């Protein structure tokens, strides 16, 4: 998506920043849904692993996409819901037996996301 537009809030106010940033967050989401929709469609064999590495690297590269530094209190309810959707996709995988061996790949992204969340604020 527009990772560069996601990096900077710019002219958008926090509430509009919510949408501007949710868009590419939603792109990562769409990528994740098909990836973790079925453990059988994509053999875990543990590339989805490339997508997970990209998700962790993306947490590092775009903390704003993962969580707003200002926090956007009102807006974040949505950022947190989106991260929870991603983590739901991941949990479905972690629920599967074959994907249970591929757990660490599911973790990497979520753990980096938690690091980012703490970085923006400990709460």
């Amino acid at each position: 998506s527009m990772i560069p537009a996601l990096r900077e809030l710019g002219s958008a106010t926090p509430e509009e920043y919510n949408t501007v940033v949710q868009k590419p967050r939603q792109i990562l989401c769409q990528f994740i849904d098909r990836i973790l929709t079925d453990v059988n469609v994509v053999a875990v064999e543990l590339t989805s692993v490339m997508l997970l590495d990209f998700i962790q690297h993306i947490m590092k590269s775009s903390p704003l996409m993962f969580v707003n530094v200002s926090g956007s209190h009102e807006a974040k309810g949505s950022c947190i819901e989106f991260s929870n959707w991603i983590i739901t996709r991941l949990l479905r995988i972690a629920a599967t037996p074959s994907c249970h061996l591929l757990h660490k790949k599911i973790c990497e992204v979520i753990c980096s996301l938690l690091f980012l969340f703490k970085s923006k604020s400990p709460a």
């Binding site: 690091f115 970085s119 400990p122 709460a123």
Partner: protein
């Protein structure tokens, strides 16, 4: 718990003093030689219930919901509480009067037994849940704790610690609505923090202050006053240590409890707000010194805990860097002492494999 019966019948929990739990049940010597013999018979009845130990079965599977993993709710425990009332509360009267030492020993033993019961039973807490003046033994305990801090006696030092610990352990498991009761402790707790109050009582104090920040009514209480805020007495005790013994492995514990409190206040989301940051800097240095001289990691678990308080201090100063954005204005005055400690601990934290990437960005700030 079956262990709760063990604890009940055990050599004096308190080190020394010749205390017999069998005297906590059967001791000739509120007074008048009536109904206290009956209290002793009641202790015997609780022992009878205790023995069978039918309650402590299969890890208390019946209880559910709040207070999850509840110490097996014990009917016998509730029974023991009354004799304890004949004990602890009597000295409280002696306290009301302008000998006492003999009473104080029995009172301390009774408080210890009460601590065990509160910790390991789901009943004596149900008594706390009852509510006011209910749970009158708590009223007696609160009176004693407030007076204990006020007067500095060899008996006063310990009693304060014990009452505080009871309050704290109970407030832990209780619900939020049930913590609106413990609210009364907040007012009396202020005296406890001051150095004049027992150091062991000040540590339990720090613990209960963390707990306060956990409570919604206790939080505002921690920073409610325009002057002081009723907090930062704790910030001041770690920085300046009023103990002749001054064992190094106590101030680290105080500051570490306080640091857990701060991280908890953060997660949960005055001039007093300002003292926590500088005190955290000071502690970051203190924990830093012990490890720096020997070099390498901790040859002590308490030393590992000092290192944990170090990492937590860097992370908490980062949160504090994000907090009151204008961190520098209040920092500058202690800024030299803090700058000495920060970057070397940055190196040390980078050295350890465990340090987190989030703790690492915190570190990055300073």
């Amino acid at each position: 718990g079956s262990i709760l019966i063990n604890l009940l019948l055990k050599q004096p929990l308190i080190p020394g003093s010749s205390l017999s739990l069998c005297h906590l049940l059967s001791s000739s010597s509120s007074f008048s030689l009536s109904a206290l013999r009956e209290a002793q018979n009641l202790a015997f009845t609780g022992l009878n219930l205790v023995a069978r130990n039918e309650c402590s079965r299969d890890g208390d599977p019946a209880e559910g919901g709040r207070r999850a993993f509840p110490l097996c709710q014990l009917p016998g425990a509730v029974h023991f509480l009354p004799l304890v009332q004949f004990f602890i509360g009597l000295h409280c009267q002696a306290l009301q009067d302008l000998s006492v030492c003999i009473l104080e020993g029995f009172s301390v033993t009774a408080l210890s037994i009460l601590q065990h019961l509160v910790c390991h039973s789901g009943a004596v807490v149900s008594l706390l849940l009852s509510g006011q003046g209910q749970h009158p033994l708590l009223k007696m305990l609160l009176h004693l704790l407030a007076f204990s801090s006020a007067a500095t006696g060899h008996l006063q030092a310990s009693v304060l610690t014990q009452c505080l610990k009871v309050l704290v352990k109970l407030a832990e498991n209780t619900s939020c609505d049930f913590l609106p009761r413990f609210q009364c402790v907040f007012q009396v707790l202020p005296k406890c923090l001051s150095p004049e109050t027992p150091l062991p009582s000040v540590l339990l104090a720090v613990e209960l202050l963390s707990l306060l920040a956990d409570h919604d009514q206790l939080a505002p209480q921690l920073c409610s006053h325009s002057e002081g805020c009723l907090l930062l007495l704790l910030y001041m005790y770690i920085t300046s240590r009023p103990d002749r013994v001054a064992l190094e492995t106590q101030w680290l514990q105080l500051e570490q409890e306080v640091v857990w409190l701060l991280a908890k206040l953060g997660v949960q989301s005055c001039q007093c707000n300002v003292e926590v940051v500088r005190a955290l800097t000071v502690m970051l240095h203190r924990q830093w010194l012990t490890v720096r001289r020997a070099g390498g990691p901790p040859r002590t678990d308490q030393q590992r805990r000092t290192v944990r308080c170090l990492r937590d201090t860097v992370l908490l100063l980062h949160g504090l860097s994000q907090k009151d954005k204008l961190f520098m204005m209040h920092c500058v005055e202690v800024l030299h002492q803090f700058d000495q400690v920060m970057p070397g601990v940055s190196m040390l934290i980078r050295g350890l494999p465990d340090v987190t990437d989030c703790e690492e960005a915190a570190l990055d700030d300073l």
